[PDB]
Amino acid sequence: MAGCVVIVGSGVIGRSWAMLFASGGFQVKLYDIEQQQIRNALENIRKEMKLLEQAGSLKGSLSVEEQLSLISGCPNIQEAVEGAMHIQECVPEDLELKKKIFAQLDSIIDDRVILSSSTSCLMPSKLFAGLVHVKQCIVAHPVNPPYYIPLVELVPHPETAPTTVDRTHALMKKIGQCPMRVQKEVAGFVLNRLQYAIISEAWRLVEEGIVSPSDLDLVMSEGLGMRYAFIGPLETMHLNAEGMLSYCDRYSEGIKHVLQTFGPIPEFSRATAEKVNQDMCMKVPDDPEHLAARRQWRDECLMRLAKLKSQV
Ligand SMILES: NC(=O)c1ccc[n+]([C@@H]2O[C@H](COP(=O)([O-])OP(=O)(O)OC[C@H]3O[C@@H](n4cnc5c(N)ncnc54)[C@H](O)[C@@H]3O)[C@@H](O)[C@H]2O)c1
Numbered sequence: 001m002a003g004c005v006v007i008v009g010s011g012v013i014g015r016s017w018a019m020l021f022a023s024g025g026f027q028v029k030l031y032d033i034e035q036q037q038i039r040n041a042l043e044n045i046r047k048e049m050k051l052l053e054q055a056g057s058l059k060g061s062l063s064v065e066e067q068l069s070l071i072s073g074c075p076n077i078q079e080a081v082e083g084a085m086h087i088q089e090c091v092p093e094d095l096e097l098k099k100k101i102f103a104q105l106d107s108i109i110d111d112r113v114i115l116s117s118s119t120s121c122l123m124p125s126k127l128f129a130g131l132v133h134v135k136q137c138i139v140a141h142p143v144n145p146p147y148y149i150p151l152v153e154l155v156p157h158p159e160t161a162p163t164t165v166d167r168t169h170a171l172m173k174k175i176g177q178c179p180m181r182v183q184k185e186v187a188g189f190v191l192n193r194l195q196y197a198i199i200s201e202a203w204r205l206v207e208e209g210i211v212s213p214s215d216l217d218l219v220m221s222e223g224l225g226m227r228y229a230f231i232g233p234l235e236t237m238h239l240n241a242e243g244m245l246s247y248c249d250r251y252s253e254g255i256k257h258v259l260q261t262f263g264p265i266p267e268f269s270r271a272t273a274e275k276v277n278q279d280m281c282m283k284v285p286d287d288p289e290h291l292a293a294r295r296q297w298r299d300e301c302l303m304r305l306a307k308l309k310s311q312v
């Protein structure tokens, strides 16, 4: 009864979105510039949904067969977007390519559909520059693997209509994800700014030999990361003293003292990358089979954690 959802780009992220939207009861049309990618996407989604069902990880109440019947290939973009209510773009991370596609869509779409990019790093102000339908534009950035990790960052353009944000929020909630709002665009949005703050100090600590990369990673996974699975950094402050003000009173002099001892932004030189890599390879060799085995274990853990979080 409501429009379908269109996925523009049936790759890694496109396929995950398709599964998310199908589980919410939405009709999904998969478009790609390569028709073979639509065919492969439909085959891989069929195979993955069977795997999820067997793991007990398939979302919502609809059967495998119900959800799969919601997803079809649609190689014609005009037909795909006709009557759509949401278009999620999932083409490669390339500003000129995204702007081209958006300019094509701009000339054919109606005033109700929402146009949403999956981009992890491009600014809405550049993506949607000069578009007639700029009010309908938004970034909805997911976290890979989005079927297990629910966070979606919603990042508007300055001229994005509030209704676009609210509609997109409600849509993300219906499919089971966890939308949040980035009020004004900034480099890295929110998630990558925190991630890169951590990477930057970790890199310096290991380059300096304060700890090995493997021990630094245990400091996170047997320590700080266990807390962060459930509570964010600001709530941690709140709970680790008698409230946030108490925590600042106790610890803020120290936080400043520690931060004032930070080294400069790394170069991330090839020489240092190679030394870090040599260390990483002791635990996880950088050939395809070893990397894929470790990612499969990672994803199983993510899936089990998602299930735990849903119960508490
Ligand atoms: N971990 C991730 O992979 C990840 C996580 C979050 C966000 N993102 C973002 O999602 C977007 C897509 O990433 P991906 O990893 O799924 O890319 P991908 O390379 O897996 O898939 C891209 C798809 O776009 C298709 N394509 C290329 N040009 C096209 C065009 N003109 N029109 C239609 N389709 C076209 C390709 O054929 C391909 O199937 C990127 O902006 C990326 O930054 C990726």
Ligand SMILES: [Cl-]
Binding pocket: 268, 269, 270, 271
């Ligand atoms: Cl270099």
